[PDB]
């Protein structure tokens, strides 16, 4: 009862990407904006994460680690949710001043990826996900990707993850009645969570390549963005950091 009150109170607010919606849609313009929105959205995730119960009792090193590995999956999941309640999953609502339409998806040279994220949005509708179920799932996403060897203090991490997995169970169970719909529901939500990883990986690779040849494509990468994508992302695409799926 108290847990849900927290996630709702610490839930970040609207964030603008600062895109010049008066300039012809181009690869450089759109991407440069997305990177900026990523920088702005990142600052809020850090604050949001700190407010997360138990997050503070995590080794400072792991705190910055988990954040640098799941920031992508978290932002996408939230974007899809916004796209679902803002445009009915019609388009991708990255930001109030950065709404992606069919045309912009192609102009971004990542139409296939946008198509996958859009499905995620539609998923929120088909499964009738509730704001409460969403809030918790997003929180669980924070502890859904860690290095293979483990964290500085894997002990506390597993304990926290276990508690959030239980919180998700509570939100569901504390509304149903029969022991049948409770399982099937937990199954669907856990499935929805894993479907985010594949999408995040494709975005990890795309942003990676973009960074490499960002000098010739005229795409600006903020400080934090370029540092995480050049140090953290590689570990993910190399196998160092692997997501934590519920199902095989």
């Amino acid at each position: 009862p108290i847990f849900l009150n927290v996630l709702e109170a610490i839930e970040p607010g609207v964030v603008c990407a600062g895109h010049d919606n008066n300039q012809p849609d181009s690869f450089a313009a759109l991407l440069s904006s997305l990177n900026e929105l990523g920088e702005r959205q990142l600052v809020h995730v850090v604050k949001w994460a700190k407010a997360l119960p138990g997050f503070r009792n995590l080794h400072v090193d792991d705190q910055m680690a988990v954040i640098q590995y799941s920031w992508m999956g978290l932002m996408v999941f939230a974007m899809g949710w916004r796209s679902f309640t803002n445009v009915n999953s019609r388009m991708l609502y990255f930001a109030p001043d950065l709404v992606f339409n069919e045309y912009r998806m192609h102009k971004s040279r990542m139409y296939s990826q946008c198509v996958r994220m859009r499905h995620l949005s539609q998923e929120f509708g088909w499964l009738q996900i509730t704001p409460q179920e969403f809030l918790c799932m997003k929180a669980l996403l924070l502890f859904s990707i860690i290095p293979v060897d483990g964290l500085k203090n894997q002990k506390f991490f597993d304990e926290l993850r276990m508690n959030y997995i239980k919180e998700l169970d509570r939100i569901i169970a504390c509304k149903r009645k029969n022991p049948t719909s409770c399982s099937r529901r937990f199954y669907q939500l856990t499935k929805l969570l894993d479907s985010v990883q594949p999408i995040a990986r494709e975005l990890h690779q795309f942003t990676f390549d973009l960074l490499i040849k960002s000098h010739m494509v005229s795409v600006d990468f903020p400080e934090m963005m370029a540092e995480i994508i050049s140090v953290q992302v590689p570990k993910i695409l190399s196998g160092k950091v692997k997501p934590i799926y519920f199902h095989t």
Binding site: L42, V46, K47, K50, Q63, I67, M224, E227, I228
Partner: peptide, 10 residues
Amino acid sequence: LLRYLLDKDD
């Protein structure tokens, strides 16, 4: 400077 964000004060 993510650490800078990690340990701000207010």
